[PDB]
């Protein structure tokens, strides 16, 4: 829970922004490959980088989201732009993003904003993911006669 809006223009995003957090995509070893900025908006997680193309990650797919000392990563399926694979990044306020992530996820923002037309619309059937399913019960044997 938080609030506070002001009509002041921003010059340069700080390294301790409440909504923004400068991250550094690292490798298994932890080395620094490229710099980027992570955004935590009710909408979804979006990474910013050089002229290169950007990326986005829907809070939905996000199956697991943890944190650690100057270490933050998330697991995504194969339906996401990037695709199947994990991505970790080195930051200074990883916890902050972790404590906020569960804040936007729980809110499950329901079309909070008027979104444009999406395939979701009723149309020809196709290979679309499937929902959850219940667990199958057990069976009962029987007694033997004389």
């Amino acid at each position: 829970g938080s609030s506070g809006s002001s009509g002041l223009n921003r010059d340069s995003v700080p390294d301790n922004h409440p909504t923004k957090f400068k991250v550094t995509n690292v490798d298994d070893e932890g080395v620094e490959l490229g710099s980027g900025v992570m955004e935590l908006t009710q909408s979804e997680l979006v990474l910013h980088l050089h002229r290169r193309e950007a990326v986005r990650w829907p809070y939905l797919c996000l199956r697991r989201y943890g944190y650690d000392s100057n270490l933050f990563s998330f697991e995504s399926g194969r339906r996401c732009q990037t695709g199947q694979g994990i991505f970790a990044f080195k930051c200074s306020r990883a916890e902050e993003i972790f404590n906020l992530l569960q804040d936007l996820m729980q809110c499950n923002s329901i079309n909070v904003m008027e979104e444009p037309v999406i395939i979701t619309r009723n149309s020809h059937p196709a290979e679309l993911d499937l929902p959850r399913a219940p667990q199958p019960p057990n069976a009962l044997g029987y007694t033997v006669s004389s």
Binding site: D28, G66, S73, T82, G85, F87, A88, Q102, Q106, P131
Partner: peptide, 19 residues
């Protein structure tokens, strides 16, 4: 977007249980 083999973290608070 380096590809990792496994999650370097251990304490995670699973949120979405849907595929």
């Amino acid at each position: 977007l380096f590809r990792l083999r496994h999650f370097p973290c251990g304490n995670v608070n699973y949120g979405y249980q849907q595929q």
